[PDB]
Design a protein around this ligand. Structure first.
Ligand SMILES: *CCC(=O)Nc1cccc(Oc2nc(Nc3ccc(N4CCN(C)CC4)cc3)nc3[nH]ccc23)c1
Length: 302
């Protein structure tokens, strides 16, 4: 029904193994066995790094209630929290990992229908975040996760920020940033908006359409703002029709107001997803197959 934050005790879940780690902390594959409920639920557990100045439990719970309220099919949901000496966030497990690695591993069998459906889903998730006044600030194929080959979800590792009712921008402080996914105004001035998220969406789409290529490969991050100001952009992927590439280019306009809105991106990519082979040209497209629950019905995977 309605998405609410569950408070878990250490007795109710178990970390099984490490999946990955970063500045944020460590993420584990885990099991949630809710007290009294007699059910066992695979989950992802994020145990956050110990901060120099740990927030009070009250502060943490307030933030967690807001993040738990984020409830959309294409955003990975926070299911519960456990506060002890550490903060552990219990998330939906996305069994197939990140979309970036998925498209690199399965590129020989990824057709136009899947690529365009993923673009739609990511746009829907981002539009929902915008409706919630959340600026993501790290959208990229590595941060979209795969529930099934047919269904992906945007995830957040701590960079997302909630804007106030009258705030149209987040002003960031120093630190490491994903330069090659960022809008010019973010690179130069540390300014983030829903429209700088749109820039990152464009780069994410480019990643997908090149089956996981690195943007501006071999170019130093420090040179990126210079090339953008000269007007250079990521090139047309070979499988993309001009129509698709033009949407992507609109995401990278210098004037943030000239970029598309996520609501518009949903409409345009939804149109294309309805006739995928008109908009993406992939050799052997009609023959390509990814694992689907209908495989048995159609006698695939013999
Ligand atoms: C491309 C970016 C990347 O590798 N992302 C990533 C790695 C590890 C954990 C993580 O956070 C969450 N992961 C999952 N599910 C998950 C992760 C990894 C894997 N496997 C796939 C197969 N390869 C060979 C090894 C790794 C399987 C499932 N679910 C989550 N829910 C919330 C956060 C995460 C992201």
């Amino acid at each position: 029904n309605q998405a609410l934050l569950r408070i878990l005790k250490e007795t109710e879940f178990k970390k099984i193994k490490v999946l990955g780690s970063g500045a944020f902390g460590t993420v584990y594959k885990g099991l949630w066995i809710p007290e009294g409920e007699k059910v066992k639920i695979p989950v992802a557990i994020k145990e956050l790094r110990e901060a120099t100045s740990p927030k009070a439990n009250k502060e943490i719970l307030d933030e967690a209630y807001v993040m738990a309220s984020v409830d959309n099919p294409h955003v990975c949901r926070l299911l519960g929290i456990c506060l002890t000496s550490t903060v552990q966030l219990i998330m939906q497990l996305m069994p197939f990992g990140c979309l970036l690695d998925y498209v690199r591993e399965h590129k020989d069998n990824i057709g136009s229908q899947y690529l365009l459906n993923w673009c739609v889903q990511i746009a829907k998730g981002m539009n929902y975040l915008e409706d919630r006044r959340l600026v993501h600030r790290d959208l990229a194929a590595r941060n979209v996760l795969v529930k099934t080959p047919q269904h992906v979800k945007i995830t957040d590792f701590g960079r997302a920020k909630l804007l106030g009712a009258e705030e149209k921008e987040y002003h960031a402080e120093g630190g490491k940033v994903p330069i090659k996914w960022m809008a010019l105004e973010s690179i130069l001035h540390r300014i983030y908006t829903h429209q700088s998220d749109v820039w990152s969406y464009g780069v994410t789409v480019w990643e997908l359409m090149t089956f996981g290529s690195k943007p501006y490969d071999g170019i130093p991050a420090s040179e990126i703002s210079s090339i953008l100001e000269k007007g250079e952009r990521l090139p047309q992927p070979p499988i993309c029709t001009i129509d698709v590439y033009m949407i992507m280019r609109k995401c990278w306009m210098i004037d943030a107001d000239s970029r598309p809105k996520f609501r518009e991106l949903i409409i345009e990519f939804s149109k294309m997803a309805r006739d995928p082979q008109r908009y993406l040209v992939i050799q052997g497209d009609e023959r390509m197959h990814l694992p689907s629950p209908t495989d048995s019905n159609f006698y695939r995977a013999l």
